[PDB]
Design a protein around this ligand. Structure first.
Ligand SMILES: CCCCCCCCCCCCCCCCCC(=O)OC[C@H](COP(=O)([O-])OCC(O)COP(=O)([O-])OC[C@@H](COC(=O)CCCCCCCCCCCCCCCCC)OC(=O)CCCCCCCCCCCCCCCCC)OC(=O)CCCCCCCCCCCCCCCCC
Ligand SMILES: CCCCCCCCCCCCCCCCCC(=O)OC[C@H](COP(=O)([O-])OCC(O)COP(=O)([O-])OC[C@@H](COC(=O)CCCCCCCCCCCCCCCCC)OC(=O)CCCCCCCCCCCCCCCCC)OC(=O)CCCCCCCCCCCCCCCCC
Ligand code: HEA
Ligand code: HEA
Ligand SMILES: CC(C)=CCC/C(C)=C/CC/C(C)=C\CC/C(C)=C/CC/C(C)=C/CC/C(C)=C/CC/C(C)=C/CC/C(C)=C/CC/C(C)=C/CC1=C(C)C(=O)c2ccccc2C1=O
Ligand SMILES: CC(C)=CCC/C(C)=C/CC/C(C)=C\CC/C(C)=C/CC/C(C)=C/CC/C(C)=C/CC/C(C)=C/CC/C(C)=C/CC/C(C)=C/CC1=C(C)C(=O)c2ccccc2C1=O
Ligand SMILES: CCCCCCCC/C=C\CCCCCCCC(=O)OC[C@H](COP(=O)(O)OCCN)OC(=O)CCCCCCCCCCCCCCC
Ligand code: HEC
Ligand code: HEC
Ligand SMILES: CCc1nc2ccc(Cl)cn2c1C(=O)NCc1ccc(N2CCC(c3ccc(OC(F)(F)F)cc3)CC2)cc1
Ligand SMILES: CCCCCCCCCCCCCCCC(=O)O
Ligand code: FES
Ligand SMILES: [Cu+2]
Ligand SMILES: [Cu+2]
Lengths: 331, 165, 139, 115, 53, 276, 223, 105
């Protein structure tokens, strides 16, 4: 950006096409821009992996496996930056294509560990669990479309179309929006001392889910037949005038879906069922559910003895450590 | 300090201008910063005139009465405050501005009003250096003149009580 | 600290491998030879992780076991006095305002605004650094 | 995004322009990616990381507030290109190579975007 | 220095585009820079004397 | 049945397009199978294990299943290796660039329209040889003799024969544009100076089976009128193409040269934009 | 080789026809006709960089030029061949005059500038703001031929000064005054931008008052 | 001097239909608010701008004010040519020029 500002305010000949100025900018920008999407993707994986065991009444499946998958995704995210520049005809295609195919694996092991953590538990679907399941579904579909996008001979047709828009909207929405709503509904008591309403939460979730899946699903078909991104107008002689209407109906449903959430937050911050205990979602972990519900300044009045990665669970259920250590390896 | 800044900075270069002639004009026509509020008030006041039998009351009359009202409300403030609060005792110890929230809020509101009027006087310079429309700056001033003072009052009241706590 | 150093060593090894492989695979098989823009970023991210890992390694070799690094430990081990954590301060918002002034003065090319922003940044940073070291007034 | 959708239905330019549409999708992408997601990450971090590791505070407590205020004022600077008569930035979110030059895209919204 | 500058400095208006003077453009800045700085130094010395003796 | 599993891909008018479509269909079916499996797993575990029934102590605290994780980390590697091999094969095939073409077009993209060149015509039949290069260049751009230039009031129509090797040479005057014909199932970026940026601006088409009219779009960010750079492609018979070329050699517009071979003079897939 | 405007109508066809037409006819959506205009209009519009323009709004701004190596001449001759507009001044070599367009009387030039030009720009040629977007730019980086062609062709929202109401001596004297006013020293210290009392009030409040209040804080105790 | 292209958007105030000579109109130059010279003339918006407090008059609609504290139109002067071809005045203003006062405009 400093190079660009120098070029704009001093005429600095840094990015002229006469030099290698057209591909230089793209290389730099995408070397920045793929780690950015992984930056905004990983912590929400963490959030959902942290919500699942509380409502499944089970430990997290494959702790060290999840840690290694995270490290692998991190290491691989910086050496795939050029799968955004297939259509320029100026990159080494097999390298980046193969390495994106490679980065597709650790996400798969992460997904399987989540499904395993939900396997044969005692499920109860309060709003955080509901939003986490929605995240699962939406992210799976988005990642499928992405790994489809990762092959060069197919990106030779679907790039710069609405297929790409549908893909990254699936992944972005399913990750940030759903995991963020899950985290809000999960940690609202631990920061406030109140409880958000649940009927409004279910209404909010269903509105969001329906509107989203109705606004972004038809764009795959809309972009497979020729309609590129970033067009302001099109002709009636072209096709695809009903799909745009369906998409805008879905967008307006998504827009209306935000009123229940802000109403719930506005009412439940001041009124709303107070929390006079630790751990309003029983069977909690992570040492944050072992301090008063609105934590004091400096966060702690006493600490428990730490022996595993579920210290609060072993604090509130001391008759469980023998059974947690005995049958921790059946699988 | 005065000698230094009278030697190093240039003020009023009358030779770049010319002698006064009623037919020519320039673009920056501002007075010194202590009349800029008078100029800004003349700029952002709407064109309300009255025409009745054989006569005319133009717009700058409004500027005249508002100016006079300000100059009359300034010297008569202590008597207003003693009539409103009802306190008539001798005082030799000062007050911290955080212990009197209402007067501090009134003063902050007046200062915000003065700042709006002063900035509305350099419309041309602001719209030229910072790329903003000119009509936009006129309307910004015309609306700020009503909505900025009360906002400043509210914030100043709450801030004073926060300091007390 | 032993595990942080190992993490950074793993990352540095992988990054160096990828950098060398990319360089030698674009030296051949490429349109114009070595690509020269991804190569540089890769060697210097390798250098980043290498610097951090080497510092952690030295600090680990120069240290005795710590209640955090140590299992088997109890809360009576860490009983003591921690460092100094700054309570309330209002200088950050002034630093941000000064930097924003300089940035908007660089966006619209206005040199006087840039000069004012730089002066304000120097003043605010000086205020932040000296906040807990000014002595009582001398009268 | 809602403005974009309601224009994209019903072929023909009903109430927008080409410039305004370009500015709309540029600012939509920019805001949604850089002024909502990257800071919400640190929001959740500042909320529940010290609680989870059992610490009383973050390492540097004033750098925290500095980060928050820098974020807020940078976002406000970048958004304030709509009050310019020419509008906000009109290139893509990605700012491709020669389109963001001085010859092409000469307005005063790209400068505010960059800073 | 103020006295010497006031007595022996080229002060007349010489402006043109042939002989770029640049010596006349420095005649008032020098007056200010010497006068103000001298009296400022005197004031600072006095303040220090009051504060320390 | 296959129009559905193609998700709206237009059928090709080129062999490589048909190979691309075959690969696309196969990969779509594979991904759908994976998604169906995993969605079944999710719906199952949420429909039956949901029973926090009348009775409960606590389910079970198990967390490690080493062989299962090894299995489910070894299978996706093979599943991606198969398709990596296939995609390498197909993308190698689609960029052959045989040395000797038969028609060579010079596509220039400037600010919000196109301009085509007709650089060289040399049939393998020995039936028609022609050279349209020009030292009119008094410097990377190419200038020709027969140039169909589009304007804001007429969609530039490109005419080509059917069943011949075509070669496209892509150059831009100001910024990056995009050259997409949705029927070729292929696209490429039109860079300002493709040689200083180490990009190859040349791709070939083996043959065009079907005749008719096809639309093309720009697929980049050009600026204001990016959505208004459309063109058209008319694929005609070789002898009709020869008649078109020799009637164009005598000074004549594109409209009349198209009308003289009993074809509509204007573009039939696209109309000029009123809202410009 | 003046019988060569094949270049000219080689660059126009690839950089202008999308907004002016193939026959210089003014596409009824964006651009004007460009028939009555001449070589001077093309020279001023392209050499300053305002030409080939992106989206186009209340004011096309000044940018970096695209064309030189004698192709501004090419487009200028091609456009002059389709009308009878004004032409650019030339010196006895055939190049564009720079030095011959400076007059010798600055009093008359300055009086003419204050009467005709200073209303929109400034006393000394700084900028000025017009209504609803548009502004009047600064006169510092424009050379002599650009000043002449600017007041001769009357660009967007700027009035058009013919050679009958503003003779050639008048134009030369105005050029001389502008070029002298932009290159003279400030014989009173650092001028604060060229404008009136707004920078002066700001400099007072942000230099003198902070110095005075800082010395007041240093001298006097706080309690 | 108004371009011959438009010459159809003029509105011609009720008492001054014949005050113009072809494409010449000759309004006054003293702003009708406080008396600064209204000299900023934008040639293709046909707007006159007073630089003192930024009023705007519509040169195509008998100099009617369309922005700011200005409330009265600019006065128009009647013009013609004489037997030799020079521009002369065809009378006087129909009303006082400049700022207003108690008596009348
Ligand atoms: C565009 C800018 C325009 C520039 C304008 C002109 C510049 C002139 C400077 C302004 C005034 C000059 C002051 C003259 C006094 C100097 C003599 C001295 O050393 O007294 C020590 C003096 C101690 O005073 P004290 O009465 O003993 O009280 C001690 C208590 O501990 C009091 O402790 P405290 O807790 O109350 O807080 C101390 C406070 C006290 O300092 C101040 O308050 C000064 C600012 C007051 C201005 C009015 C504020 C208006 C804002 C609204 O300082 C701070 O808070 C930290 C700010 C850092 C100031 C120094 C950084 C210089 C930046 C240079 C660039 O400390 C200072 O004031 C130092 C400030 C100036 C630095 C020295 C001069 C260097 C100038 C540039 C160098 C290159
Ligand atoms: C480019 C962006 C530059 C970023 C600035 C550097 C950030 C460094 C953060 C890493 C460590 C954080 C830290 O130590 O907290 C200190 C402190 C945080 O205080 P805290 O959170 O309450 O914790 C207190 C600590 O426990 C205990 O803290 P402490 O009180 O013991 O202080 C530790 C030490 C801090 O240790 C250091 O990090 C020294 C680093 C050397 C500074 C070199 C930066 C120059 C940038 C190049 C310019 C391009 O402070 C010093 O010894 C004096 C530092 C002087 C700072 C000089 C900055 C001048 C910038 C003006 C540029 C104008 C010229 C260009 C035209 O942050 C700072 O003092 C750094 C100033 C950041 C202002 C941002 C500038 C915009
Ligand atoms: C927040 C997130 C985000 C995430 C997570 C991703 C994830 C991925 N993305 Fe995406 N992407 C974007 C955001 C994101 N992307 C954005 C914003 C753009 C373009 C923006 C711009 O251009 O303007 C983009 C564009 C983009 C492109 C180029 C589009 C172009 O042509 O222009 C490509 C492919 O190269 C791509 C690929 C991938 C791949 C391979 C993944 C993989 O990470 C995902 C793998 C995921 C899975 C879910 C697999 C599930 C695993 C199992 C179930 C095992 C299954 C196994 C087999 C089928 C093998 N992305
Ligand atoms: C993290 C990110 C993110 C999110 C959440 C979104 C959210 C949405 N996006 Fe966006 N989008 C991008 C990232 C994101 N997008 C990116 C990166 C691009 C492409 C960038 C580019 O090309 O440059 C893009 C481009 C893009 C396009 C196409 C632009 C183009 O033509 O190419 C479209 C529409 O088709 C779209 C639609 C939507 C819709 C309908 C939502 C819906 O999710 C949002 C529904 C939201 C609401 C309606 C808010 C509710 C508002 C009201 C209640 C109004 C109230 C008002 C006040 C109180 C102020 N996005
Ligand atoms: C005020 C308007 C809105 C201008 C702001 C610019 C706008 C386009 C974006 C602002 C972004 C904003 C909405 C978000 C928050 C930004 C954050 C709070 C910091 C920015 C604040 C700004 C930079 C402070 C200055 C604003 C402005 C009104 C101050 C006017 C100062 C006056 C005009 C100085 C006059 C002046 C001039 C004009 C000179 O040319 C000059 C030349 C040489 C020396 C001195 C001067 C000088 O003092
Ligand atoms: C405090 C007082 C005003 C209360 C009066 C009580 C009131 C009820 C009486 C009635 C008054 C009426 C009703 C409304 C008043 C509004 C207006 C019309 C009054 C006219 C004159 C008025 C009385 C003068 C008071 C104005 C006020 C006291 C100014 C003081 C400002 C403060 C205390 C300075 C502190 C230190 C200072 C901030 C140093 C930093 C520099 C900053 C940037 C100064 C800001 C600044 C200023 C203030 C400029 O004037 C200015 C002018 C031209 C260009 C730029 C600037 C500029 O940047
Ligand atoms: C962005 C910063 C980029 C680089 C900084 C290093 C500066 C390197 C210094 C060397 C310059 C040089 O030697 O270049 C000589 C040329 C001759 O050009 P000319 O046309 O022929 O002369 C006719 C002149 N008008 O002058 C110039 O460009 C003038 C150079 C401008 C000075 C650099 C700007 C510094 C501003 C700092 C930005 C701070 C903003 C922070 C907000 C977040
Ligand atoms: C549609 C984008 C566009 C492009 C591309 C363009 N112009 Fe312009 N041109 C305009 C517009 C709009 C105006 C109206 C002047 C104004 O409002 O600033 C104009 C005005 C002009 C004028 C002055 C008209 C007058 O009456 O004085 C000339 C001369 C000119 N253009 C020539 C050119 C040249 C030379 C090129 C470079 C080959 C070019 N145009 C490319 C849009 C464009
Ligand atoms: C407010 C009406 C107005 C008047 C009166 C006026 N100008 Fe302009 N001037 C403008 C506008 C508006 C532009 C910008 C035109 C453009 O950018 O296409 C301009 C542009 C210019 C430029 C180009 C500046 C540059 O850096 O390219 C010059 C030189 C110039 N005028 C000189 C003059 C002279 C000399 C006079 C007096 C005879 C004058 N102007 C009178 C409004 C005016
Ligand atoms: C609008 C101001 C302005 N626009 C511009 C534009 C450009 C430039 Cl460069 C400067 N300016 C300025 C300007 O300089 N403003 C300062 C100013 C304002 C008003 C007065 N007036 C004096 C006496 C009158 C008066 C006299 C007798 C009275 O007695 C009665 F009738 F009984 F009430 C009442 C009022 C009112 C105020 C002086 C200076
Ligand atoms: C209340 C704060 C408003 C924030 C910014 C709103 C921007 C509004 C843009 C529309 C105004 C006119 C734009 C240019 C003219 C059209 O045409
Ligand atoms: S004097 Fe013309 S607007 Fe007040
Ligand atoms: Cu791309
Ligand atoms: Cu395009």
């Amino acid at each position: 950006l400093f190079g660009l500002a120098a070029d704009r305010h001093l005429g600095a000949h840094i990015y002229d096409p006469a030099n290698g100025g057209v591909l230089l900018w793209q290389h730099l920008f995408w070397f920045f821009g793929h780690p950015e999407v992984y930056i905004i993707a990983l912590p929400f994986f963490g959030i959902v992996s942290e919500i699942f065991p509380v409502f499944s009444r089970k430990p997290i499946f494959g702790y060290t496996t999840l840690i290694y998958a995270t490290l692998a995704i991190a290491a691989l995210s910086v050496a795939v930056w050029a799968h955004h520049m297939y259509a320029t005809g100026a990159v080494l295609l097999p390298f980046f294509s193969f390495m994106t195919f490679l980065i597709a694996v650790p996400t798969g092991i992460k997904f399987f560990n989540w499904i395993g953590t939900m396997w044969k538990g005692q499920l109860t679907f309060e709003t955080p669990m509901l939003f986490s399941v929605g995240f699962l579904i939406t992210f799976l579909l988005g990642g499928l479309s992405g790994v489809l996008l990762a092959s060069p001979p197919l990106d030779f047709h679907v790039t710069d179309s609405y297929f790409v828009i549908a893909h990254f909207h699936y992944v972005l929405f399913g990750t940030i929006v759903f995991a963020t709503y899950a985290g809000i509904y999960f940690w609202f008591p631990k920061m406030t001392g109140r409880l958000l309403d649940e009927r409004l939460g279910k209404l909010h979730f269903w509105l969001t889910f329906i509107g989203f899946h109705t606004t972004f699903l038809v764009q795959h078909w809309l972009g497979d037949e020729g309609m590129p991104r970033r067009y302001a107008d099109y002709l009636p002689t072209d096709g695809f005038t009903t799909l745009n209407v369906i998409s805008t109906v879905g967008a307006f449903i998504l827009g209306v879906s935000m009123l229940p959430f802000v109403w719930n937050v506005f009412k439940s911050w001041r009124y709303g069922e107070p929390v006079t205990v630790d751990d309003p979602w029983g069977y909690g972990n992570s040492l944050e559910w072992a301090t008063s519900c609105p934590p004091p300044r400096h966060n702690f009045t006493e600490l428990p003895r730490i022996r595993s990665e579920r210290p609060a669970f072993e604090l509130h259920y001391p008759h469980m450590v023998e059974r947690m250590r005995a049958e921790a390896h059946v699988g | 300090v005065l000698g230094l800044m009278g030697g190093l900075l240039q003020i009023n270069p009358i030779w770049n201008l010319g002698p006064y002639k009623p037919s020519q004009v320039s673009a920056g026509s501002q007075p010194d910063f202590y009349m800029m509020w008078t100029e800004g008030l003349a700029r952002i006041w709407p064109p309300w005139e009255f025409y009745f039998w054989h006569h005319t009351i133009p717009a700058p009359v409004w500027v005249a009465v508002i100016m006079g009202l300000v100059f009359v409300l300034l010297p008569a403030y202590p008597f207003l405050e003693k009539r409103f609060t009802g306190d008539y005792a001798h005082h030799n110890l000062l007050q911290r501005p955080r212990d009197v929230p209402v007067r501090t809020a009134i003063g902050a509101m007046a200062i915000a009003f003065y700042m709006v009027l002063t900035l509305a006087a350099m419309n041309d310079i602001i719209a030229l250096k910072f790329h903003i429309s000119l009509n936009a700056t006129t309307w910004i001033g015309r609306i700020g003149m009503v909505i900025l003072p009360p906002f400043v009052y509210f914030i100043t009241y709450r801030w004073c009580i926060g300091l007390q706590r | 600290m032993h595990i942080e150093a190992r993490l950074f060593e793993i990352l540095t090894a992988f990054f160096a491998l990828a950098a060398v492989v990319y360089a030698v695979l674009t030296a051949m098989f490429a349109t114009g030879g070595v690509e020269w823009a991804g190569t540089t970023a890769l060697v210097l991210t390798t250098g980043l992780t290498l610097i951090t890992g080497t510092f952690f390694r030295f600090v680990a070799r120069r240290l005795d076991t710590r209640p955090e690094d140590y299992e088997d430990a109890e809360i009576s081990d860490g009983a003591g006095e921690l460092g100094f954590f700054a309570p309330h301060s209002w200088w950050p918002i002034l630093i941000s305002l000064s930097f924003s002034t300089a940035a908007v003065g660089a966006a619209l090319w206005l040199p006087w605004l840039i000069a004012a922003g730089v002066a304000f940044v120097i003043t605010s940073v000086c205020g932040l650094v000296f906040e807990y070291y000014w002595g009582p007034e001398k009268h | 995004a809602l403005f974009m959708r309601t224009e994209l239905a019903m072929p023909g330019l009903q109430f927008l322009s080409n410039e305004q549409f370009n500015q709309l999708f540029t600012m939509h992408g920019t805001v949604m990616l850089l002024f909502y997601a990257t800071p919400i990450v640190f929001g959740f971090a500042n909320l529940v990381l010290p609680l989870q590791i059992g610490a009383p505070d973050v390492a540097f407590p004033r750098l925290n507030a500095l980060s928050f205020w820098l974020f807020l004022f940078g976002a406000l600077i970048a958004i304030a290109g709509f009050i310019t008569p020419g509008g906000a930035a009109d290139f893509g979110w990605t700012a491709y190579s020669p389109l963001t030059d001085a010859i092409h895209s000469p307005g005063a919204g790209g400068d505010l975007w960059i800073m | 220095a103020l006295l010497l500058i006031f007595l022996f400095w080229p002060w007349e208006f010489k402006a043109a585009d042939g002989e770029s003077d640049f010596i006349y453009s420095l005649t008032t800045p020098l007056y200010g820079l010497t006068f103000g700085l001298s009296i400022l130094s005197i004031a600072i010395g006095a303040v220090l004397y009051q504060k320390r003796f | 049945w296959s129009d559905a599993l193609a998700l709206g891909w237009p059928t090709g008018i080129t062999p490589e397009a048909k190979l691309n479509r075959e690969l696309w269909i196969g990969s779509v079916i594979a991904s759908f199978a994976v998604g169906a499996i995993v969605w079944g797993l999710i719906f199952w575990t949420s429909a039956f294990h949901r029973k926090k029934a009348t009775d409960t102590e606590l389910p079970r605290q198990f967390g490690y299943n080493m062989p299962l994780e090894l299995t489910l980390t070894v299978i996706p590697f093979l599943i991606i290796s198969v398709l990596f091999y296939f995609t390498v094969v197909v993308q190698e095939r689609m960029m052959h660039k045989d040395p000797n073409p038969e028609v060579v077009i010079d596509v220039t993209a400037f600010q919000w329209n196109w301009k085509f060149g007709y650089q060289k015509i040399a049939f393998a039949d020995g039936s028609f040889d022609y050279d349209g290069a020009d030292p009119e260049r008094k410097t990377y751009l190419n200038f020709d003799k027969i140039e169909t230039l589009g304007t804001s009031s007429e969609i530039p129509v490109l005419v080509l024969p059917a069943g011949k090797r075509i070669e496209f040479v892509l150059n831009s005057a100001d910024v990056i544009h995009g050259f997409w014909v949705p029927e070729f199932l292929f696209k490429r970026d039109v860079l300002p100076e493709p040689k200083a940026n180490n990009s190859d601006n040349v791709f070939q088409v083996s043959e065009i089976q079907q005749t008719g009219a096809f639309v093309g779009r720009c697929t980049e960010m050009c600026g204001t009128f990016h959505a208004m750079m459309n063109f058209e492609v008319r694929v005609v018979e070789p002898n009709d193409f020869k008649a078109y070329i020799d009637q164009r050699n005598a000074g004549k517009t594109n409209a009349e040269a198209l009308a003289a071979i009993n074809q509509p003079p204007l573009a039939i897939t696209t109309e000029p934009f009123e809202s410009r | 080789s003046s019988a060569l405007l094949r270049t000219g109508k080689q660059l126009f066809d690839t950089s202008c026809v999308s907004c002016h037409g193939a026959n210089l006819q003014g596409v009824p959506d964006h651009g004007p006709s460009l028939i009555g205009v001449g070589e001077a209009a093309v020279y001023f519009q392209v050499s300053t960089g305002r030409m080939p323009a992106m989206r186009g709004e209340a004011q096309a701004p000044r940018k970096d030029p695209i064309f030189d190596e004698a192709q501004i001449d090419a487009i200028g001759a091609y456009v002059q061949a389709n009308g009878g507009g004004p032409t650019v001044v030339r010196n006895p070599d055939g190049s564009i005059a720079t030095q011959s367009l400076r007059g010798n009387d600055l009093g008359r030039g300055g009086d003419l500038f204050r009467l005709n030009c200073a209303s929109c720009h400034n006393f000394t040629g700084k900028g000025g703001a017009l209504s609803s977007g548009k502004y009047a730019p600064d006169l510092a980086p424009a050379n002599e031929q650009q000043i002449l062609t600017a007041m001769l062709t009357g660009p967007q929202n700027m009035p058009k000064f013919s050679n009958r109401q503003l003779s050639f001596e008048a134009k030369k004297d105005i050029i001389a005054y502008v070029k002298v006013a932009t290159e003279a020293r400030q014989p009173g210290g650092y001028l604060l931008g060229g404008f009136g009392p707004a920078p002066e009030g700001m400099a007072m409040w942000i230099i003198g008052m902070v110095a005075a209040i800082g010395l007041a804080l240093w001298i006097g105790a706080r309690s | 001097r108004i371009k011959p292209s438009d010459l159809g958007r003029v509105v011609k105030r009720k008492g001054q239909e014949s005050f113009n000579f072809g494409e010449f109109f000759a309004f006054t130059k003293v702003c009708s608010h406080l008396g600064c010279p209204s000299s900023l003339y934008e040639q293709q918006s046909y707007r006159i701008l007073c630089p003192c407090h930024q009023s705007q008059f519509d040169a195509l609609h008998f100099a009617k004010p369309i922005f700011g504290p200005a409330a009265r139109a600019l006065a128009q002067l009647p013009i013609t040519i004489d037997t030799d071809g020079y521009l002369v005045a065809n009378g006087d203003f129909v009303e006082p020029v400049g700022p207003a006062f108690w008596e009348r405009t």
